[PDB]
Write a protein that binds this ligand. Structure first.
Ligand SMILES: CC(C)CCC[C@@H](C)[C@H]1CC[C@H]2[C@H]3CC=C4C[C@@H](O)CC[C@]4(C)[C@@H]3CC[C@]12C
Ligand SMILES: CC(C)CCC[C@@H](C)[C@H]1CC[C@H]2[C@H]3CC=C4C[C@@H](O)CC[C@]4(C)[C@@H]3CC[C@]12C
Ligand SMILES: CC(C)CCC[C@@H](C)[C@H]1CC[C@H]2[C@H]3CC=C4C[C@@H](O)CC[C@]4(C)[C@@H]3CC[C@]12C
Ligand SMILES: CCCCCCCC/C=C\CCCCCCCC(=O)OC[C@@H](O)CO
Ligand SMILES: CCCCCCCC/C=C\CCCCCCCC(=O)OC[C@@H](O)CO
Ligand SMILES: CCCCCCCC/C=C\CCCCCCCC(=O)OC[C@H](O)CO
Ligand SMILES: CCCCCCCC/C=C\CCCCCCCC(=O)OC[C@H](O)CO
Ligand SMILES: Nc1nc(NCCc2ccc(O)cc2)nc2nc(-c3ccco3)nn12
Ligand SMILES: CCCCCCCC/C=C\CCCCCCCC(=O)O
Ligand SMILES: CCCCCCCC/C=C\CCCCCCCC(=O)O
Ligand SMILES: CCCCCCCC/C=C\CCCCCCCC(=O)O
Ligand SMILES: CCCCCCCC/C=C\CCCCCCCC(=O)O
Ligand SMILES: CCCCCCCC/C=C\CCCCCCCC(=O)O
Length: 388
């Protein structure tokens, strides 16, 4: 058996390295948003929220994990706080990730009402409640759901703890049914599945909105090819009725209104020419639609096409952040599941326990890199602060 202090030394060095990167990179996220006003949205108030959580992982959670791994003698309720504080920070990140997903869904499904419905004053309100809730979930073991009442007193005496003290070790004070049923299943896993669903609806609503754009546009010009080589007033009449409905449907800030104001006007009067039975001037009236089409309506579907793609790009960046949360945190939850559901199994070896803790702590480093690679406003603000 190698002295504990050398394996301890690798663990502690890596933990400290992670803390440094967690705080540095996430202090940059908070500085970017404070300085650049283009980055001050409700969306970014939640990203500043989870950057705060990531900062306090480095400043508090990682120092707590280093000390909890020594088994130091302590009063059991003080042990519980050292052991559970990181669950607060994890819960807070789950709420922040959930909020940005709902925000991005509101943005895409009802852009009309978005600015009305979502506002930075209520956002700050939601954020406070989410932190209060996060303390409640994460420190529930302190309200009595703990093993403090049945200490492992042989281990306390070996360490020579004083009276009332335990050897402070995570799996000794925190019950595993808390961790698996309450923490993992109810508070982590259910919210993640909800996120999954929100992101599915977002990409679905963006895909069918693009389809509706391209449908209205191919509806516009096939009708025109129909008027083109028609027979009589009655089918030009139909080919322009299908156009105008498609115009008003596609309509749902001043040069855009003109382009449709002309288009429907041009359709409208070709309609009355058709009704009065004049066929080929009703034709002739319907092909400088072709002109308004090239000068106006196709810049509309193009920049409309351009904006939905940005929103999908923004929603995929957010999805990556949530996926990496799940990746980095599930292994540890899965191990707890084995510990709890299979008492016939050998406990996961100590080196794997600490690999899993280290990997969950690593999640606090990755988000700043995801912003810098994926959102240009963040990337250029990072560059501007660094050079200066
Ligand atoms: C705002 C920030 C800077 C303050 C951080 C406060 C932390 C460091 C404080 C708050 C509560 C503290 C202790 C709570 C009670 C106990 C039990 C005792 O037997 C050992 C010390 C121990 C385990 C704690 C040590 C650290 C402690 C956790
Ligand atoms: C990418 C993420 C989500 C998947 C992670 C899968 C990891 C966490 C899985 C893969 C294999 C798993 C277990 C395989 C079997 C053993 C031996 C058993 O006595 C304790 C649990 C233990 C030690 C494993 C626990 C964790 C485990 C390592
Ligand atoms: C990954 C996301 C989508 C869902 C999480 C699935 C988890 C809850 C699933 C995946 C693998 C599962 C089990 C794998 C095999 C074993 C050994 C058995 O003796 C007790 C159940 C136990 C320990 C697992 C229980 C939980 C289990 C870990
Ligand atoms: C104890 C609490 C310690 C918390 C540490 C991390 C919080 C520091 C970061 C919180 C500051 C948020 C910020 O400045 O950016 C948002 C504004 O620009 C919005 O307009
Ligand atoms: C994601 C969808 C959710 C999946 C969770 C499935 C959890 C079901 C896991 C139950 C494991 C179990 O019951 O072990 C049996 C032993 O207790 C008997 O020896
Ligand atoms: C222990 C709790 C520590 C920090 C609380 C989290 C800090 C959260 C920082 C969020 C700041 C923010 O989002 O700003 C809102 C803005 O005022 C909208 O107008
Ligand atoms: C805002 C920035 C401020 C930064 C804040 C720094 C965070 C504190 C660091 C580590 C806390 C862990 C300290 C707990 C260690 C206690 C050890 C102990 O209690 O020794 C007792 C002995 O074993 C017999 O009682
Ligand atoms: N099971 C567990 N253990 C620890 N530390 C104890 C690692 C260990 C496990 C057994 C042992 O004999 C000595 C040390 N931290 C832990 N953190 C979590 C956790 C936090 C959030 C989700 O799971 N689980 N967890
Ligand atoms: C990503 C970082 C890669 C490096 C990962 C190394 C993680 C730590 C494994 C160290 C094993 C030591 C067990 C802890 C000993 C103890 O404190 O009781
Ligand atoms: C930005 C400020 C961050 C503050 C970090 C403080 C650094 C503390 C580093 C590790 C603390 C480990 C304490 C060891 C536990 C006591 C040992 C024992 O009781 O046996
Ligand atoms: C829901 C939001 C409210 C959450 C906080 C509610 C109050 C809990 C107060 C319990 C007092 C802690 C004492 C536990 C103990 O030390 O044994
Ligand atoms: C375990 C399921 C993980 C879901 C995380 C949410 C990420 C959504 C991805 C698109
Ligand atoms: C490389 C990172 C680890 C990858 C997978 C770990 C697989 C777990 C094997 C260890 C099992 C320990 C045991 O049963 O004795």
């Amino acid at each position: 058996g190698a002295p504990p202090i050398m394996g301890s030394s690798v663990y502690i060095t890596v933990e400290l390295a992670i803390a440094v990167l967690a705080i540095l990179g996430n202090v940059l996220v908070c500085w970017a948003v404070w300085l650049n006003s283009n980055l001050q949205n409700v969306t970014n108030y939640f990203v500043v929220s989870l950057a705060a959580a990531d900062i306090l992982v480095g400043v508090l959670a990682i120092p707590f994990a280093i000390t909890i791994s020594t088994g130091f003698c302590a009063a059991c309720h003080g042990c519980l706080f050292i052991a559970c504080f990181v669950l607060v920070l994890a819960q807070s990140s789950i709420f922040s990730l959930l909020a940005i997903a709902i925000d991005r869904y509101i943005a895409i499904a009802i852009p009309l009402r978005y600015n009305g419905l979502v506002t930075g004053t209520r956002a700050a309100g939601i954020i406070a409640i989410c932190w209060v809730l996060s303390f409640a979930i994460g420190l529930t073991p302190m309200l009595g759901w703990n093993n403090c009442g049945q200490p492992k007193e042989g281990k306390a005496h070996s360490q020579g703890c004083g009276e009332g003290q335990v050897a402070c070790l995570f799996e000794d004070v925190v019950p595993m049914n808390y961790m698996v049923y309450f923490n993992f299943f109810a508070c982590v896993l259910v919210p993640l599945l909800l996120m999954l669903g929100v992101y599915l609806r977002i990409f679905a609503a963006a895909r069918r909105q693009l389809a509706d754009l391209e449908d209205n546009w191919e509806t516009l010009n096939d009708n025109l090819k129909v008027i083109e080589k028609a027979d009589n007033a009655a089918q030009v009449k139909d080919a322009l009725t299908k156009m105008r409905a498609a115009a008003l449907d596609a309509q749902k800030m001043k040069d855009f209104r003109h382009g449709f104001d002309i288009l429907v006007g041009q359709i409208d009067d070709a309609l009355k020419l058709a009704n009065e039975g004049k066929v080929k001037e009703a034709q002739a009236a319907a092909e400088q639609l072709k002109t308004t089409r090239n000068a106006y309506i196709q810049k509309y579907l193009e920049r409309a096409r351009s904006t939905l793609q940005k929103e999908v790009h923004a929603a995929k960046s957010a999805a990556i952040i949530a996926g990496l949360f799940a990746l980095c945190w599930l292994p540890l939850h899965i191990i707890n599941c084995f510990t709890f559901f299979c008492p016939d199994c050998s406990h996961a070896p100590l080196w794997l326990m600490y690999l899993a803790i280290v990997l969950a702590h690593t999640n606090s480093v990755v988000n700043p890199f995801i912003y810098a690679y994926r959102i240009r406003e963040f990337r250029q603000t990072f560059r501007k602060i660094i050079r200066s």
